[PDB]
Write a protein that binds this DNA or RNA. Structure first.
Lengths: 71, 71
DNA sequence: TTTATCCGCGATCGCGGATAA
DNA sequence: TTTATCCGCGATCGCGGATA
């Protein structure tokens, strides 16, 4: 768990968490009630993703976030 | 620095950091080059706010984020 | 099976700009 | 001075759905 500085970095880290637990986009989507396509857009093109989508996906991954010093 | 679970909670936490440092929306917006209106929409209505905006505002605040376990 | 891409649709974004208050 | 709100604009969202 490290500091995250961009949407791309964020999406890559969460995608890795998804893969490391062997979850599919479809099963995560079903779990929180959004489209599989929405998870695919977030993983690939996270820049315009809504905060609401990010939080729903975070919950699906059994994750949360905290703020920290940029340093 | 607490676990954050929603856009509102995130926006409230970041607004608080802005105020605790005595920073105005205008000076943050000018610092990273976005609209003052954009920071205002984020603070009040964060749900559909983009990941790009959220990250720009974090940088303006000298903040970063980290993922963690949801518990 | 898994993931990425496309349609139309209604909604909202963030922009420049100008207010409102 | 500070922050919230509105306009028009082009872009993109996330939706149900159906492909690639």
């Amino acid at each position: 768990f490290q500091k995250i500085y961009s949407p791309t970095q964020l999406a890559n880290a969460m995608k890795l968490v998804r893969q490391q637990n062997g979850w599919t986009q479809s099963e995560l989507a079903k779990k929180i009630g959004i489209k599989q396509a929405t998870i695919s857009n977030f993983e690939n093109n996270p820049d315009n993703t809504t905060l609401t989508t990010f939080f729903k996906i975070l919950q699906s991954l059994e994750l949360s976030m905290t703020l920290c010093d940029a340093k």
